[PDB]
């Protein structure tokens, strides 16, 4: 019949590793709406670059470049009855360099001493996986409570070096997105002959961050590992609390994994490394937030030309989100007929000029959500 633009599909976040990027947008409306794409708040002119084509709201870039094309993209859909703006979608890029070609000096340690072999990975993105190899690939390093690989530092941690450990160690890096894979030069591991090392209490050489902030429903991995003789044992504890039963110990107790974060799971977490000569511990903080989510959106409304109007948006989230309103993609300033307090829109006596698309925003530090509806004015 006759109605303003309504979102059927909105842009999703995309990470580019066939050299093409596609950003999605689709709306239904009568007459058929036309689309417009912004980047970083400013409208893109599709003519300004031949790499930019558009196929039914779907924004496409052939030959994507990280510098030229990175940013936040939005979809501006309009017809005769008004305009609506989509959520901001991130366009970022995956990339993986090669290791340094320089020979890596032999590392010499006493028998029974612990060692930390440096990965020293190439320039890359946060979306990678570390891996180590003994002498030759694919002869991967056996992982246990004496040999641990940090997925945060990339380094290989060996607690109580013995004769069998003597050899060369090669670091590996796979980018999960691009699937690419690069290898380091060998690092020789040798044993001194200036006597051996005795027994000593464990020393934590890698741990999880002092502070982390994760979203509800996500998974967090907290690694903690020490160098000791005898080989340390690692135990976990929530300070003045409880390790949630849903959690699982991984990589020989060195990793505590808490799937499905809830506001409850927030708190201080302590790992403890221990042998027969003493203990050492580390405390880190985990705090959980939640993205904004709609409780009460705004629906389409018809209203007689002299009637009052009161629209209300209600949303959840931590921290509590704030609200701001749009009419046809443009902000609604105060000191005008259209009054807005938090998530409430009020007009004392509407009129024909007020007919158009309206949007409600709920937002906090971590995200902003949108809701739209058409306001029709029955004429006098």
Swiss-Prot record:
Glycans are attached at residues 40, 98, 299, 351. It comes from the Eukaryota. It is found in: Cell membrane. Residues 5-92, 98-184, 202-287, 292-376 form the Ig-like C2-type domain. Disulfide bonds join 25-75, 119-171, 224-271, 313-360. Expressed in the nervous system. Preferentially expressed in the central auditory pathways. Belongs to the immunoglobulin superfamily. Contactin family. Contactins mediate cell surface interactions during nervous system development. Has some neurite outgrowth-promoting activity in the cerebral cortical neurons but not in hippocampal neurons. Involved in neuronal activity in the auditory system. Interacts with PTPRG. This is Contactin-5. The gene is Cntn5. The chain holds residues 96 to 477 of 1098 of the full protein.
